Amino acid sequence: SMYTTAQLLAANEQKFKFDPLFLRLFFRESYPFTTEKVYLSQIPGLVN
Amino acid sequence: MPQKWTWIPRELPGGRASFIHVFEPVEDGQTRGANVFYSVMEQMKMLDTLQNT
């Protein structure tokens, strides 16, 4: 019951600036582990 | 575990071959093939265990 007409010209998808620089530059290798915990080790390496 | 993945097109734009893939499918859609051991992998291992025991 409305006789007015309309036309859509353009639509834009706003977004915020997001670039993962820190995990791009430094964290380069991925290790999927199926176990429960994860171990990392450090060896002193000071020999007289 | 692998750490770098590279893309290699199968065929060059000129029509020459750049990557070769060979296998025999059985069903309609099969992306990658399966070895011939699936029928007897289990019996082989159990035979090995029986022999050693």
- B6 to chain A, any CB pair closer than 8 A? The answer is no
- B1 to chain A, any CB pair closer than 8 A? The answer is yes
Interface of A with B (CB under 8 A): 28-31
Q: Which residues of chain B does A31 touch, with a Cβ-Cβ cutoff of 8 Å?
A: 1
Cβ atoms of residues B34 and B40 within 8 Å? no
Rounded CA-CA distance A5/A2 in Å is 9
Cβ atoms of residues A28 and A20 within 8 Å? no
Rounded CA-CA distance A46/B6 in Å is 40
DSSP label at B44? H
Cβ atoms of residues B19 and B7 within 8 Å? no
Q: Which residues of chain B does A29 touch, with a Cβ-Cβ cutoff of 8 Å?
A: 3
Resolution (A): 4.0
- B3 to chain A, any CB pair closer than 8 A? The answer is yes
| Alpha helix (H) residue ranges in chain A | 21-25
| CA A37 from centroid of its chain's CA atoms | 23
Kindly report the nearest CA distance between residue A48 and chain B, in angstroms.
Answer: 36
